[PDB]
């Protein structure tokens, strides 16, 4: 039960999205559940990069498209990263994924 809230929140949120997406899910419920993903997609639309995944499809860049998808959902791991960094800071340690050679 140390990190159960983050994993079960991920499960609950994606389960509700997958149950309702493309059928009756409102955009308000989507922007409420994942505000940072909507913020990143809105950045893409604002900066004239609305066809950016189409552009990565045109160049055949499969690894760049996989990275684009992974970076737009990179904030899902950020609660765990902040919690583990605070755990390492209370123990006096340095967080492993924060270091270059770590």
């Amino acid at each position: 039960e140390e990190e159960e809230l983050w994993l079960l929140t991920l499960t609950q949120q994606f389960k509700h999205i997958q149950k309702h997406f493309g059928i009756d899910l409102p955009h308000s419920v989507v922007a409420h559940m994942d505000p940072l993903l909507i913020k990143k997609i809105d950045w893409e639309t604002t900066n004239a990069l609305e066809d950016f995944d189409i552009t990565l499809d045109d160049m055949g860049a499969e690894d760049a498209k996989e990275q684009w998808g992974a970076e737009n959902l990179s904030h899902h791991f950020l609660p765990l990263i902040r919690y583990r960094r605070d755990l390492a800071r209370k123990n006096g340690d340095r967080y492993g994924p924060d270091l270059v050679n770590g």
Binding site: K19, H20, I23, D24
Partner: protein, 52 residues
Amino acid sequence: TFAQRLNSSPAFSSFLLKREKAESEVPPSELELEAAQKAAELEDPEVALRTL
């Protein structure tokens, strides 16, 4: 199922699609049907606790 959730969607309450069914276009597979049945058996959380 996905066709059942589509039938309850607002677009099948629109006038041109009142009498249409979502199962008529793509029918649900039997894994989808038995998964809907199995999920209906597990919506009781006590039954899921006892089963697990």
